[PDB]
Amino acid sequence: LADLFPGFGSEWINTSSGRIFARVGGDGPPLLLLHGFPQTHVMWHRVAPKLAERFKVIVADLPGYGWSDMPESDEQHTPYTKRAMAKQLIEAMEQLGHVHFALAGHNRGARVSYRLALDSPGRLSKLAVLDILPTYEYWQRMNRAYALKIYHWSFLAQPAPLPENLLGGDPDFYVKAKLASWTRAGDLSAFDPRAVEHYRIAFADPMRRHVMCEDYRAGAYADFEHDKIDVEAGNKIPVPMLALWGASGIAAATPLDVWRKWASDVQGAPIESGHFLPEEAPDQTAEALVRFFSA
Amino acid sequence: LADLFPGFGSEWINTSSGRIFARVGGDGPPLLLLHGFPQTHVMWHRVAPKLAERFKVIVADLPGYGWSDMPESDEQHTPYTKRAMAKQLIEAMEQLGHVHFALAGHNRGARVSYRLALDSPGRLSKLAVLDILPTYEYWQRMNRAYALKIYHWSFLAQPAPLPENLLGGDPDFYVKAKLASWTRAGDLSAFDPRAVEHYRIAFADPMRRHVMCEDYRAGAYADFEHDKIDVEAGNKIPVPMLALWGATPLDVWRKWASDVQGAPIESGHFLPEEAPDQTAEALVRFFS
Numbered sequence: 001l002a003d004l005f006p007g008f009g010s011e012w013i014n015t016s017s018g019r020i021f022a023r024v025g026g027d028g029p030p031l032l033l034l035h036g037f038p039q040t041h042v043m044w045h046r047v048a049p050k051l052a053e054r055f056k057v058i059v060a061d062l063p064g065y066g067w068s069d070m071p072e073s074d075e076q077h078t079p080y081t082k083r084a085m086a087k088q089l090i091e092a093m094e095q096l097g098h099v100h101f102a103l104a105g106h107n108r109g110a111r112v113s114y115r116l117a118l119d120s121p122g123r124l125s126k127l128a129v130l131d132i133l134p135t136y137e138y139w140q141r142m143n144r145a146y147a148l149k150i151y152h153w154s155f156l157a158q159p160a161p162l163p164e165n166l167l168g169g170d171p172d173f174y175v176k177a178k179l180a181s182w183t184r185a186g187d188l189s190a191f192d193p194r195a196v197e198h199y200r201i202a203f204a205d206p207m208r209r210h211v212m213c214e215d216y217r218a219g220a221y222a223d224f225e226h227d228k229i230d231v232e233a234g235n236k237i238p239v240p241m242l243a244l245w246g247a248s249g250i251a252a253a254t255p256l257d258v259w260r261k262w263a264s265d266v267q268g269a270p271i272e273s274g275h276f277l278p279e280e281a282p283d284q285t286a287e288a289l290v291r292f293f294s295a
Numbered sequence: 296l297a298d299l300f301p302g303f304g305s306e307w308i309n310t311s312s313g314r315i316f317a318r319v320g321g322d323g324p325p326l327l328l329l330h331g332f333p334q335t336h337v338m339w340h341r342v343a344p345k346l347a348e349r350f351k352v353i354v355a356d357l358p359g360y361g362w363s364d365m366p367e368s369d370e371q372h373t374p375y376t377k378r379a380m381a382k383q384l385i386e387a388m389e390q391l392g393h394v395h396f397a398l399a400g401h402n403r404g405a406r407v408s409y410r411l412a413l414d415s416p417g418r419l420s421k422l423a424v425l426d427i428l429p430t431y432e433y434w435q436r437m438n439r440a441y442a443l444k445i446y447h448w449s450f451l452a453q454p455a456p457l458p459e460n461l462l463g464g465d466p467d468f469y470v471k472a473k474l475a476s477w478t479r480a481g482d483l484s485a486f487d488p489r490a491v492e493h494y495r496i497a498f499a500d501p502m503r504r505h506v507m508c509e510d511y512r513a514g515a516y517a518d519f520e521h522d523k524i525d526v527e528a529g530n531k532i533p534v535p536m537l538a539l540w541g542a543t544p545l546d547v548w549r550k551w552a553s554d555v556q557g558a559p560i561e562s563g564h565f566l567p568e569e570a571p572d573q574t575a576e577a578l579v580r581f582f583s
């Protein structure tokens with residue numbers, strides 16, 4: 001497996017919940033980057049060099065993903081809830097001496113991020129969320145057309161071992177089809193092939209697949225309940241926020257109008273891209289982030 | 296593979312779209328019984344005898360299921376639309392000289408059945424549907440709770456080859472899990488193991504699984520649009536109808552049908568296997 005981060009160090013950070021793997025580079029204000037599904041930390045490899053010119057950049061594998069440890073799950077999927085993930089990443093950042101930091105997330109990693117902002121706003125200087133709406137909003141909008149367009153939220157959330165058994169026959173085919181499907185073009189041309197191999201090797205481990213299923217089960221149950229509490233209470237994130245989305249991404253109204261309901265100081269823009277902003281549109285995504293976190 | 300229909304013949308019935316396999320038994324007024332997913336005609340083995348006491352009973356594999364031939368599909372999944380399946384079964388019944396008949400269906404076969412009633416009501420003396428609502432109504436209900444409970448409606452409808460690739464790895468586990476998970480008991484104890492083996496064997500064939508996905512693709516697309524035309528027009532089935540359901544559905548069906556009665560049955564989804572005495576008694580009473 002390639003090293004996609006020239007001159008970044010490598011840390012395995014202890015926490016009460018298990019080790020977090022990270023690459024660490026640059027210097028300046030601390031910025032944590034969180035990937036999602038079906039990826040690992042390496043999906044930031046096109047933008048991290050540019051960010052490292054201005055920030056101390058911490059590129060972490062989510063709890064249970066990549067080279068991070070995999071806690072045993074439970075009947076409420078607790079360790080793979082976004083609440084739990086956020087707590088674990090807070091601990092990992094305190095191990096580095098970072099109690100107040102900037103954060104950018106994509107997909108599951110973005111969900112961790114906004115949940116962190118709702119639970120522990122004082123931890124964050126600023127927050128960016130890439131190509132997502134809140135988990136509550138994804139579920140609320142559910143109807144036939146959404147159910148058919150993006151099916152995997154309900155599929156992976158089926159009780160174990162249904163999705164795990166289905167995914168075990170030909171895992172490579174599933175992971176690669178997902179990666180291609182969510183890009184602008186519908187192919188793998190956006191991705192460095194060495195990055196694709198990181199994703200494929202992760203996905204090839206049944207223990208890593210089970211984590212991804214627990215993640216989505218959390219996404220259907222507890223994470224959705226946690227979000228519902230907030231929206232019904234009228235709680236908004238006070239941390240300055242950026243919402244960046246792909247014009248051909250996954251996230252009627254614009255994602256910016258959705259986020260205004262969840263955040264009292266939010267800006268946003270689309271980028272011409274599928275879901276995978278940092279790989280499909282690296283220059284633009286890096287520029288948007290640098291500008292936001294520096295301003 | 297066991298013979299679960301004592302005193303029934305076995306016929307291959309010709310149609311413009313391919314052969315329909317059926318077990319045929321009994322004498323008297325004609326009654327067609329249609330299975331659904333992931334089963335075959337054999338799921339009626341517990342109730343067909345009692346019905347054959349009073350009716351000529353035709354137990355048919357749906358187009359593409361079981362031993363019925365598999366018509367070639369197309370980009371709109373046409374031969375696995377309920378409209379097209381109902382046309383095909385009308386032609387099969389004509390080959391027997393039955394142009395006015397009673398019909399009971401379960402799951403996918405219940406959808407063929409209410410579609411046949413909406414399109415060609417003169418074909419039917421009476422109609423029974425088991426443990427379904429109309430396709431349009433499921434889709435209208437498709438919020439977070441329904442997306443979770445009826446996830447397969449979206450998963451099996453994904454474009455080929457996604458569900459076919461996933462189902463090939465361990466088909467036996469998937470078929471057995473669907474069978475179990477929709478019963479009251481949550482296991483396979485309600486089924487005859489011989490019946491289970493018929494279902495497993497059909498499901499083990501990639502071409503048979505492809506047909507199932509084509510059925511669910513029709514279920515998400517054309518079948519939905521056919522139904523939506525009827526609900527937007529205010530069309531109600533005029534045929535005398537019974538809705539049985541596993542323990543309202545009757546209130547739903549009264550919006551779709553002008554002469555409908557209904558009752559719950561103590562059962563999970565698979566009424567004719569989980570609750571064979573109660574289902575047979577209800578069907579015999581209605582169809583008599």
Ligand SMILES: [Ca+2]
Nearest residue numbers: 014094095096
């Ligand atoms: Ca330490």
Ligand SMILES: [Cl-]
Nearest residue numbers: 132133138251
């Ligand atoms: Cl989203």
Ligand SMILES: [Cl-]
Nearest residue numbers: 281282283284
């Ligand atoms: Cl770019």
Ligand SMILES: [Cl-]
Nearest residue numbers: 331402403427
């Ligand atoms: Cl059905």
